[PDB]
Coordinates of C-alpha atoms (C1' of nucleotides) and ligand atoms in Angstrom, one line a residue:
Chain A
X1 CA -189.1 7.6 -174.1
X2 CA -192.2 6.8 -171.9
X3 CA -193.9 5.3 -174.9
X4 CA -192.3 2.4 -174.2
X5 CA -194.7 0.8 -171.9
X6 CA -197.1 1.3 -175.2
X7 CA -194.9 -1.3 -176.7
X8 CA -194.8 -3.5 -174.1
X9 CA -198.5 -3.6 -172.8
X10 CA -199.4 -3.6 -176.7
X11 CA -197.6 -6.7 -177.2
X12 CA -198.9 -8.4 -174.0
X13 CA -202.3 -8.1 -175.2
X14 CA -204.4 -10.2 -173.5
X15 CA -202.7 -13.4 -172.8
X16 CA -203.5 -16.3 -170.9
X17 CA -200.9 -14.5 -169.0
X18 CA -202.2 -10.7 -168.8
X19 CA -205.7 -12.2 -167.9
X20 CA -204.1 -13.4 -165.0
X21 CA -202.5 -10.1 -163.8
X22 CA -206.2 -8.6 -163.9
X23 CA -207.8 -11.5 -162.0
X24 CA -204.2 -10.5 -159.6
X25 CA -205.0 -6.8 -159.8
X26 CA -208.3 -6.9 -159.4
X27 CA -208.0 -9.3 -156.1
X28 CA -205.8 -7.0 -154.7
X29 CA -208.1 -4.0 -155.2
X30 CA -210.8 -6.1 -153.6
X31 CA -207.9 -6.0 -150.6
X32 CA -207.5 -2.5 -150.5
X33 CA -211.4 -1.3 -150.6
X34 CA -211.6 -4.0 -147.9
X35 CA -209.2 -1.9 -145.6
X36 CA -210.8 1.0 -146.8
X37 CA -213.8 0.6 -145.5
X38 CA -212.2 -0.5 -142.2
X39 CA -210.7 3.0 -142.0
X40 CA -214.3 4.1 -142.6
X41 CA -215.0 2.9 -139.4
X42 CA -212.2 3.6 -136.8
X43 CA -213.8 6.1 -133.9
X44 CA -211.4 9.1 -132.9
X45 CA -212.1 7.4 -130.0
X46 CA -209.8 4.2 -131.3
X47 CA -207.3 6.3 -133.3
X48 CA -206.0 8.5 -130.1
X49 CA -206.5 4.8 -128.6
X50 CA -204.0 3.7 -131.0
X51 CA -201.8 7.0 -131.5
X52 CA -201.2 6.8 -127.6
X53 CA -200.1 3.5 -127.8
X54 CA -197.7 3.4 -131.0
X55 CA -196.3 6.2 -129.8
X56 CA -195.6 5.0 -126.7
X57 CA -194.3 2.1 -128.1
X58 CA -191.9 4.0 -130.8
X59 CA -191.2 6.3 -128.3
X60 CA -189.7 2.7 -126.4
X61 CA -187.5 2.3 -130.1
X62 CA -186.5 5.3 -130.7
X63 CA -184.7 4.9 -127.4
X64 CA -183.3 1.2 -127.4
X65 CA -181.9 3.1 -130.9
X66 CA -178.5 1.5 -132.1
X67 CA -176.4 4.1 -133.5
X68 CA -172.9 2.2 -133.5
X69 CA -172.5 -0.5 -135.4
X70 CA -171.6 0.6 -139.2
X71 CA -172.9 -1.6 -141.6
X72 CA -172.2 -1.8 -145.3
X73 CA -174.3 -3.1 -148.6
X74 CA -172.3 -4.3 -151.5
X75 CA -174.0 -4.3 -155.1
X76 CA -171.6 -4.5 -157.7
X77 CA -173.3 -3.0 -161.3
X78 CA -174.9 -5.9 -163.7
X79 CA -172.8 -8.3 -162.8
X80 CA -174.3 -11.6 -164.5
X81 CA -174.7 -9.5 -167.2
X82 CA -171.2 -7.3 -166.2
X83 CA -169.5 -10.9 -166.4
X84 CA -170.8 -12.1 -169.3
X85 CA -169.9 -9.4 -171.4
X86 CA -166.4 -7.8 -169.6
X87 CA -165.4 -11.3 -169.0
X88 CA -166.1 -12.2 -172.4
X89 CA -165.7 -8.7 -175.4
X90 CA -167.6 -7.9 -178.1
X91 CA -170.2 -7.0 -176.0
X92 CA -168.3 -4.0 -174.6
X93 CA -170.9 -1.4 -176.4
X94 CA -173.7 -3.5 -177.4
X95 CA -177.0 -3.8 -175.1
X96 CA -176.8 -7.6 -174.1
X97 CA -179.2 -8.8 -171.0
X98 CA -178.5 -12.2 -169.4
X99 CA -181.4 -15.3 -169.1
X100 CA -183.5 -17.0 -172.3
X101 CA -185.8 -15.9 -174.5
X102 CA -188.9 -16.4 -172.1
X103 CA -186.8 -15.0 -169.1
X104 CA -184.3 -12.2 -168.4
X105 CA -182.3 -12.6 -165.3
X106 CA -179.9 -9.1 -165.7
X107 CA -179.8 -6.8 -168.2
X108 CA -176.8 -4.8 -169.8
X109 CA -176.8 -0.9 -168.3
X110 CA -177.0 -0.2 -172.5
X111 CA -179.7 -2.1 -172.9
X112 CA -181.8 -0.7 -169.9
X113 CA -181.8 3.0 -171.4
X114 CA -184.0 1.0 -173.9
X115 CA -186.2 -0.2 -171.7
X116 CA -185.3 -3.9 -171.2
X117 CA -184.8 -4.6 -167.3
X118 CA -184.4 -7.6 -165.4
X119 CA -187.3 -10.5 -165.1
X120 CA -188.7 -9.1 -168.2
X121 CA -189.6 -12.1 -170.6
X122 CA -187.3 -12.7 -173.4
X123 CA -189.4 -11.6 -176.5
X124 CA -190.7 -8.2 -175.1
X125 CA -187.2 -7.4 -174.7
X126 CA -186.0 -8.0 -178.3
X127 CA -190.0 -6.4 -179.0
X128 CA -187.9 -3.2 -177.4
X129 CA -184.9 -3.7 -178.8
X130 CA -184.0 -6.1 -181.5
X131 CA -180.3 -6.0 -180.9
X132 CA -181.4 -7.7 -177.8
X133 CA -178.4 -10.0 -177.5
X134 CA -179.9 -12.4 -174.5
X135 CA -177.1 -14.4 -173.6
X136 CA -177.6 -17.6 -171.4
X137 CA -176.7 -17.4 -168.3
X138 CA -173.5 -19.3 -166.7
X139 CA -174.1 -20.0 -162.8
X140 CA -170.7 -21.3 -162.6
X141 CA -168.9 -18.8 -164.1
X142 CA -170.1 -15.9 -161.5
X143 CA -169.6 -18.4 -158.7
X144 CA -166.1 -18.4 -159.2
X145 CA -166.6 -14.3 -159.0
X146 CA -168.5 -14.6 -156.3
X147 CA -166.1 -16.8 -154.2
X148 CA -163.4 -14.8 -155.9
X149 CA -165.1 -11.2 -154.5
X150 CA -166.6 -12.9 -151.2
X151 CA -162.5 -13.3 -150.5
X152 CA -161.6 -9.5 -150.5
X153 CA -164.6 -9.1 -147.4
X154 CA -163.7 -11.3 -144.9
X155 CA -160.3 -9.1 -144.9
X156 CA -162.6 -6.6 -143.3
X157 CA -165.6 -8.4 -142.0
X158 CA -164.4 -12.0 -141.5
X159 CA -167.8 -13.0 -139.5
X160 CA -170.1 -11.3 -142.4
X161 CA -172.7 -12.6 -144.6
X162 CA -173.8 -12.1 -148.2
X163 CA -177.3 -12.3 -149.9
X164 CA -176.4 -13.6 -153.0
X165 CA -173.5 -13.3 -155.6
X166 CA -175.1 -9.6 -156.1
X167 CA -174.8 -8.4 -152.9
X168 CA -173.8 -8.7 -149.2
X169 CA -173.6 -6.9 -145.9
X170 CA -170.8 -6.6 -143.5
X171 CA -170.8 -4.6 -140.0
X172 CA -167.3 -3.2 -140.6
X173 CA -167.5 -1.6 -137.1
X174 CA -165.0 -4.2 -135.3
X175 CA -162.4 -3.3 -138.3
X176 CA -162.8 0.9 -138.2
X177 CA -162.0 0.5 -134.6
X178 CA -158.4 -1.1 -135.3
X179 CA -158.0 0.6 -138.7
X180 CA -157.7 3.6 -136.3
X181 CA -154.1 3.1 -136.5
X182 CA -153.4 0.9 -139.2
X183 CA -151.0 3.7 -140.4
X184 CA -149.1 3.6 -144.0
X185 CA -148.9 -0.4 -144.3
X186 CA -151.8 -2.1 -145.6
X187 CA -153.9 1.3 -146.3
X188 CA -152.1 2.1 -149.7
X189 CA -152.9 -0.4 -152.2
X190 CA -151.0 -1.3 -155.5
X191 CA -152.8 0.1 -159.2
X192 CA -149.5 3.9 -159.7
X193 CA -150.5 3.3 -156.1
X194 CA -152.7 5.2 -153.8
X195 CA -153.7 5.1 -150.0
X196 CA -156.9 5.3 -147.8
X197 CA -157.8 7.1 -144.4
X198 CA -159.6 5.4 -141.6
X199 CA -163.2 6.8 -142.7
X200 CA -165.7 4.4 -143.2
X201 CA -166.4 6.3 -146.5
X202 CA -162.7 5.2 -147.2
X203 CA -163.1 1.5 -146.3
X204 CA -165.5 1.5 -148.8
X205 CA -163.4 2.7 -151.7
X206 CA -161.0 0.2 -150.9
X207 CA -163.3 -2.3 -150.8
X208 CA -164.2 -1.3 -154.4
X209 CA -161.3 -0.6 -155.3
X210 CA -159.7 -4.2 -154.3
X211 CA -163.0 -5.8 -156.1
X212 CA -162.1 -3.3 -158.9
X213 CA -158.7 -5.0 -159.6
X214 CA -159.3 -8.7 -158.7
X215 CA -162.5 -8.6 -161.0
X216 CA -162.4 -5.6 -163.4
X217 CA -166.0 -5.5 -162.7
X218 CA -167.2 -2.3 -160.6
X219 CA -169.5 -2.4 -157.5
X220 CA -171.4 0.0 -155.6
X221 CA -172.3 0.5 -152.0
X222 CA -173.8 2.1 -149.1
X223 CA -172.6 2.5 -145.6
X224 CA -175.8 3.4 -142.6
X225 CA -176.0 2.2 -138.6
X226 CA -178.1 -0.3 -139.8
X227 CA -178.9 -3.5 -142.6
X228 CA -182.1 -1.6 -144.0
X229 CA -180.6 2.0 -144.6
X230 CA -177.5 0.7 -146.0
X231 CA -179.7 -1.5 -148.7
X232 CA -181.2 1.6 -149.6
X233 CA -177.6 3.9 -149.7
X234 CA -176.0 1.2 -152.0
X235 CA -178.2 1.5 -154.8
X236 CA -178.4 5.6 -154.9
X237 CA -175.1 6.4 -156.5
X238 CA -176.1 3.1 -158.3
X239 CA -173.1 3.0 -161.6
X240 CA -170.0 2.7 -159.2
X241 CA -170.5 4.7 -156.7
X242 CA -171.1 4.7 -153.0
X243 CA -173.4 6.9 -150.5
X244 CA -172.9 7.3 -146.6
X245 CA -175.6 8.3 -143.5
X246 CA -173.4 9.8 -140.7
X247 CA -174.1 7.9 -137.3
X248 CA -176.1 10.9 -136.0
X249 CA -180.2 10.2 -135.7
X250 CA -180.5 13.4 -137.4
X251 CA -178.6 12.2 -140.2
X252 CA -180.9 9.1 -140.7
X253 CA -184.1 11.2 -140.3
X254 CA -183.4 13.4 -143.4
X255 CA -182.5 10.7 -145.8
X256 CA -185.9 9.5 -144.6
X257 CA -187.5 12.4 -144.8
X258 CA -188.5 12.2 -148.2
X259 CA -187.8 8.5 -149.2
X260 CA -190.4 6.7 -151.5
X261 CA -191.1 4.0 -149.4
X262 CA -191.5 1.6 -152.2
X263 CA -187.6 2.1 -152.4
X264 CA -186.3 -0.5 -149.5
X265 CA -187.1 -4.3 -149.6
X266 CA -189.7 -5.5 -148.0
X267 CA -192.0 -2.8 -149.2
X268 CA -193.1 -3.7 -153.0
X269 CA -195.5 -3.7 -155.9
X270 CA -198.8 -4.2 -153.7
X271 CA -197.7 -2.6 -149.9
X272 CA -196.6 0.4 -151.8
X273 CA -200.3 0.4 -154.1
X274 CA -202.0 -0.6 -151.1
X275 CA -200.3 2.6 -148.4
X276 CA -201.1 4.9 -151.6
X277 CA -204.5 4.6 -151.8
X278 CA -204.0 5.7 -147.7
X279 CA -202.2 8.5 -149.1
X280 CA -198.6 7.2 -147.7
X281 CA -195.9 7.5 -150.2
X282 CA -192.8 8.5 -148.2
X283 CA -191.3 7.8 -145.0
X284 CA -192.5 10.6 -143.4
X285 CA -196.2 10.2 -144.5
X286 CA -195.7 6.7 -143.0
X287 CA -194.9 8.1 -139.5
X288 CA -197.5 10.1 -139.0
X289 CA -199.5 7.6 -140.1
X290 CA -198.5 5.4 -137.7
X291 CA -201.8 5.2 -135.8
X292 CA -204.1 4.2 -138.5
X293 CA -201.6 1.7 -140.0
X294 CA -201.8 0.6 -136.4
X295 CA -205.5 -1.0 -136.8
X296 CA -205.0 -2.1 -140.0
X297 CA -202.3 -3.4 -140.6
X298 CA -201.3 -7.4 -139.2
X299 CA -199.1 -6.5 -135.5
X300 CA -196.4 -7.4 -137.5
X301 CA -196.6 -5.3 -140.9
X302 CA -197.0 -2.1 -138.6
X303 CA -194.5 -2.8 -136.5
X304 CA -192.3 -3.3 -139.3
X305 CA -193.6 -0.1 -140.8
X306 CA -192.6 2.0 -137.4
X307 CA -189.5 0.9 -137.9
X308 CA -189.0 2.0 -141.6
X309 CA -190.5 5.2 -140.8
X310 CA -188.4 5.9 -137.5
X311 CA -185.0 4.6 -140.4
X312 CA -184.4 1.6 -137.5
X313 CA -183.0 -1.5 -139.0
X314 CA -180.8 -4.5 -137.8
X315 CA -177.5 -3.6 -136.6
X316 CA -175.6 -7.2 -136.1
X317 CA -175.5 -9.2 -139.1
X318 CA -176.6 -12.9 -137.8
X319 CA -175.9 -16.0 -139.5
X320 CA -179.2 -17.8 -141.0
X321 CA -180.9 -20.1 -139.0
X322 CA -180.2 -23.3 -140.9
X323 CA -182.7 -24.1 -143.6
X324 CA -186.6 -23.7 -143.9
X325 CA -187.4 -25.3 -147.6
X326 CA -186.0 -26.7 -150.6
X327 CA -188.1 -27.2 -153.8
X328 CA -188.3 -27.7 -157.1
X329 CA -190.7 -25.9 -160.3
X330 CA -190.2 -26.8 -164.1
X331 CA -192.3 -24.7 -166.3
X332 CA -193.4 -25.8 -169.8
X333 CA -195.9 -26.4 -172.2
X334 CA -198.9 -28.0 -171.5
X335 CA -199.1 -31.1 -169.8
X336 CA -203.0 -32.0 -169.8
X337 CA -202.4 -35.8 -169.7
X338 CA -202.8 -37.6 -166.2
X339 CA -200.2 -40.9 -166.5
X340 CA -197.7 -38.6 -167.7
X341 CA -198.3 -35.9 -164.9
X342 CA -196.9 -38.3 -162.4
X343 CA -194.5 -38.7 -164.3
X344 CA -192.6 -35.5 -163.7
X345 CA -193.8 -35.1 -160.5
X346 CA -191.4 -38.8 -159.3
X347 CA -188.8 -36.9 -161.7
X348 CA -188.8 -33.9 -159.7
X349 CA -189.0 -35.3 -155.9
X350 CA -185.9 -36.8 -157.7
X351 CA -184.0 -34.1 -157.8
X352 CA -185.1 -33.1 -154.9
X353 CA -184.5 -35.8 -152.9
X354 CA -180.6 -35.5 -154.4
X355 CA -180.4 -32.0 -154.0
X356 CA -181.6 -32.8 -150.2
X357 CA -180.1 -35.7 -149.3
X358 CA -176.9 -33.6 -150.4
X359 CA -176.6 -31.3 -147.2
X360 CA -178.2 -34.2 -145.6
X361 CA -181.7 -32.9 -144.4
X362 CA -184.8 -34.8 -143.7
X363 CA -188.0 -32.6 -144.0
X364 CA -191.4 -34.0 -142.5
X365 CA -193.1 -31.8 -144.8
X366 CA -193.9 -32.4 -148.6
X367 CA -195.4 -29.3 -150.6
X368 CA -196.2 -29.6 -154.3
X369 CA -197.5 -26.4 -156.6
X370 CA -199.6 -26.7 -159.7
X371 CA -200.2 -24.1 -162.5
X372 CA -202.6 -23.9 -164.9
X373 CA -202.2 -22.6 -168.5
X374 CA -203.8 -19.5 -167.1
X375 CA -201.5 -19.5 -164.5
X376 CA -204.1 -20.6 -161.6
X377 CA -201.3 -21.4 -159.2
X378 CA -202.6 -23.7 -156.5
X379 CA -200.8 -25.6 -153.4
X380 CA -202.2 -28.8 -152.0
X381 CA -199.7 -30.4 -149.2
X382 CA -199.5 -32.9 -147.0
X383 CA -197.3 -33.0 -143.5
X384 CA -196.1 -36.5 -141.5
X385 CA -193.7 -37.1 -138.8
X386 CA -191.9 -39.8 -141.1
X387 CA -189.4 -37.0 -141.0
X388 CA -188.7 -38.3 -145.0
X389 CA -185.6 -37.7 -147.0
X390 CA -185.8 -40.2 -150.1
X391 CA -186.9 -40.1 -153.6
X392 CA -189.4 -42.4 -153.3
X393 CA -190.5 -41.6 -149.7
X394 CA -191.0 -38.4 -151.1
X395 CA -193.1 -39.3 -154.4
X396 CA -195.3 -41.3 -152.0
X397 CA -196.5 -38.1 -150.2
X398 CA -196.4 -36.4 -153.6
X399 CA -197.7 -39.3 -156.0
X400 CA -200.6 -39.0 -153.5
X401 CA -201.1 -35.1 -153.7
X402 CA -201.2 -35.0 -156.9
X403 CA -203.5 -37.9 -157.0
X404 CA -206.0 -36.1 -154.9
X405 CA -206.2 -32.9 -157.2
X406 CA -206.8 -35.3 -160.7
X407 CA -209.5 -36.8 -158.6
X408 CA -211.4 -34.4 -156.6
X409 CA -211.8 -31.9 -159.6
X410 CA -211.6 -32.1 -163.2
X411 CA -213.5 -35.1 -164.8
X412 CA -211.7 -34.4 -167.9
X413 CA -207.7 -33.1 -168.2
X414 CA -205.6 -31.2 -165.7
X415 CA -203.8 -28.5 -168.3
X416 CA -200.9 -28.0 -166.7
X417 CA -198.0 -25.4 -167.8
X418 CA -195.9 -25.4 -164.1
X419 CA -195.1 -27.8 -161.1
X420 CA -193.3 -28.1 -158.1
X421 CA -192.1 -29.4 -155.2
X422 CA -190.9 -28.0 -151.6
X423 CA -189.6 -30.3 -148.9
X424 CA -189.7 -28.5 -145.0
X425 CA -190.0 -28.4 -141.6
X426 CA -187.1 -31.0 -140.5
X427 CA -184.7 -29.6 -137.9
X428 CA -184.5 -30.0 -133.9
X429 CA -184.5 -26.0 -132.7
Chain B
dG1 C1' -203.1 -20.6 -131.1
dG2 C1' -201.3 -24.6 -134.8
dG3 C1' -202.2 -24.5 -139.8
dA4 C1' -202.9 -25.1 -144.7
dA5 C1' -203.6 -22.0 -149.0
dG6 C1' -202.0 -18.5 -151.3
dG7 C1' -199.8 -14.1 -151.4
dA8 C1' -195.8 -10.8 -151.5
dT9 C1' -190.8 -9.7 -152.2
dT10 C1' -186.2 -10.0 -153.5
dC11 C1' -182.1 -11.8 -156.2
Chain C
dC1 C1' -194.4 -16.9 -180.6
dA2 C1' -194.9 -17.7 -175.3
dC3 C1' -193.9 -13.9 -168.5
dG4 C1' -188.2 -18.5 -164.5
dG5 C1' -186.8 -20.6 -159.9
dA6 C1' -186.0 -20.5 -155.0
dA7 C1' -186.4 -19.2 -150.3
dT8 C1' -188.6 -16.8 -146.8
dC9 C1' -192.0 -14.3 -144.7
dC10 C1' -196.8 -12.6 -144.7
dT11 C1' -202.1 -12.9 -145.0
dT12 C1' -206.7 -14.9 -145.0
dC13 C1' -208.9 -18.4 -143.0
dC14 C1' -210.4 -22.8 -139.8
dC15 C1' -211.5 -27.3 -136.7
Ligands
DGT501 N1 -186.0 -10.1 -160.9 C1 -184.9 -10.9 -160.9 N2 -183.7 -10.3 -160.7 C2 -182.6 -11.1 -160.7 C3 -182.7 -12.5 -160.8 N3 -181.5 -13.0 -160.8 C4 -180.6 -11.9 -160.6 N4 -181.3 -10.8 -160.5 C5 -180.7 -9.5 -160.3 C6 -181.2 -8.4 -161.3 C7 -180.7 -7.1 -160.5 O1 -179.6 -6.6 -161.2 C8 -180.3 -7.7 -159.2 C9 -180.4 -6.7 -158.0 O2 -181.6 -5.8 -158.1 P1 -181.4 -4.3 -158.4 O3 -182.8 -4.0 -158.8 O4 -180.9 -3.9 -156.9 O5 -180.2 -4.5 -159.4 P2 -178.7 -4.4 -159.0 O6 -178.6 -4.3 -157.5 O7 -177.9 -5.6 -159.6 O8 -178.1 -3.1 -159.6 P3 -177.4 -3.2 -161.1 O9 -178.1 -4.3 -161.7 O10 -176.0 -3.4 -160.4 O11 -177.7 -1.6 -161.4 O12 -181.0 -8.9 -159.0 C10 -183.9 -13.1 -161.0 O13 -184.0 -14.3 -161.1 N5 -185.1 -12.2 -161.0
CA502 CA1 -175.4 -5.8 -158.5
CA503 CA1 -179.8 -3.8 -154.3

DNA sequence: GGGAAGGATTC
DNA sequence: CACGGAATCCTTCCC
């Protein structure tokens, strides 16, 4: 029932929150007519300038295209909130949803039908659904599942890589090429019993199949030439089940065809409002829109929109170039008073400097974030070559940054509801 | 062009 | 009664 964003809006009023998503909303308006206008102005001349040279360039793609690598999305169903309940009955019917009562990190598949979904604050959800059960969440607890899941992949990718503990990718393409005759032996697995064929679409039954048994939990996946279409196969046949895209271009270029483009990751609340308003809403209405997206669009966002559009995406799975940050945010009610500002902020380079100094790092780069009560985020940082790595080095940079803000502005207090701080830019590339 | 501020996105 | 936390990459400027 629809009406439920009548509930939710209605009881989001106008909040020192809500008032923030217009003075959000209404900046990022101010960006679109801003590119409007732009448009306005583009000759022919420059579009068939432009046209001539994407397509010469895509043309350059479409070529160097990789169709042989077969890559593979994992997204097992709920899962936080899969874990907490399966792992844990009573909640095997009832519509629970993992995270607090300001913050919802999953939600139960029961308790989605009623409109609750995940980062939805914890009071609209019950506001939706009073048999909101939000159960805290347990970081450990999936870990061990994670570590416990992440174990069956490495039989078939052993050099893979995950996201998170929701997901992970895995070129199975040096596997399918031995499982060619793997025959009989390790094909049939034990419930009784049953065996699978050397399709990829098979690999990837038995891969939720062996998660099936050494978890209970289910999982879902997709299987595409490349890391972007994959994403976007996983999550189609989303409750436990699993979607394929033949190696053929073909193949990729109707699953394209008409695919909201909001629906793969990159591409989210503001591009897809902002391509709208240029009448793009599917992959297809972003190719041949390639030109104007061409001058307006940083030479980075377009070229990353050519590929979407052309259903290009990476093909070897590459492991993540060390580190770039590390930070720290505690949010809370106001915090107006200055000598006990600085207070939290040494508390938190703290932590941080433990949670650094623990993988051994040594930033030259301190960051911190301040948020009003109105949610003014703001970022004032400072950068030094005294490549730091301590507590205290640390709160000197910081002490000082947040020194300058209390200072500069604000005669009288600094209302603060949220603070942080980042530590980055330390390796030797 | 090297950046600092501040967004945008995804789990 | 109260809209998280992190990490990474992108966008709008500057000196
Ligand atoms: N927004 C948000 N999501 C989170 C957070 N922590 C975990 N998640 C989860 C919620 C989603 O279930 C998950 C993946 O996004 P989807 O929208 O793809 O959900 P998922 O893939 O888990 O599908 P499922 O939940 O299995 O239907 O990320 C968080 O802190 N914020
Ligand atoms: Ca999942
Ligand atoms: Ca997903």
């Amino acid at each position: 029932k629809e009406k439920i964003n009548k509930i939710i809006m209605e009881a989001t009023k106008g909040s020192r929150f809500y008032g923030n998503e217009l003075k959000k909303e209404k900046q990022v308006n101010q960006r679109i007519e801003n590119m409007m206008q732009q448009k306005a102005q583009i000759t022919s001349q420059q579009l068939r300038k432009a046209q001539l040279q994407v397509d010469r360039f895509a043309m350059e793609l479409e070529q160097s295209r990789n169709l042989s690598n077969t890559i593979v999305h994992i997204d097992m169903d709920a899962f936080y909130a899969a874990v907490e309940m399966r792992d844990n009955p009573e909640l095997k019917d009832k519509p629970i949803a993992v995270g607090s009562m300001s913050m919802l990190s999953t939600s139960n598949y029961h308790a989605r039908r009623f409109g609750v979904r995940a980062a939805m604050p914890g009071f609209i959800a019950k506001r939706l659904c009073p048999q909101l059960i939000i159960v805290p969440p347990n970081f450990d607890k999936y870990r061990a599942v994670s570590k416990e899941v992440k174990e069956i992949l490495a039989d078939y990718d052993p050099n893979f890589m995950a996201m998170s503990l929701d997901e992970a990718y895995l070129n199975i393409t040096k596997h399918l090429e031995e499982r060619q005759n793997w025959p009989e032996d390790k094909r049939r697995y034990f419930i009784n019993s049953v065996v699978f064929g050397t399709s990829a679409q098979e690999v990837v039954k038995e891969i939720r199949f062996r998660i099936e048994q050494k978890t209970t939990l289910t999982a879902s996946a997709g299987i595409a030439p490349n890391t972007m279409l994959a994403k976007v196969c996983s999550d189609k046949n989303k409750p436990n089940g699993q979607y394929q895209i033949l190696p053929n271009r073909q193949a990729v270029m109707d699953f394209i065809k008409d695919l909201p483009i909001r629906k793969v990751s990159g591409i989210g609340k503001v591009t897809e409002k902002m391509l709208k308003a240029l009448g793009i809403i599917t992959c297809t209405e972003l190719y041949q829109q390639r030109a104007l997206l061409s001058l307006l669009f940083s030479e980075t966002s377009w070229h990353y929109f050519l590929h979407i559009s052309l259903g290009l995406g990476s093909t070897h799975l590459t492991r993540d170039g060390e580190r770039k940050s590390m930070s720290v945010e505690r949010t809370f009610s106001e915090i107006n008073k200055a000598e006990e500002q600085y207070s939290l902020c040494q508390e938190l380079c703290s932590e941080l400097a433990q949670d650094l100094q623990k993988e051994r790092l040594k930033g030259r780069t301190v960051t911190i974030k301040l948020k009003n009560v109105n949610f003014e985020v703001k970022t004032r940082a400072s950068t030094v070559s005294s490549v730091v790595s301590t507590a205290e080095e640390i709160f000197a940079i910081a002490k000082e940054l947040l020194k300058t803000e209390i200072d500069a502005d604000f005669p009288h207090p600094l209302r603060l509801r949220l603070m942080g701080v980042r530590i980055s830019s330390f390796p030797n590339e």
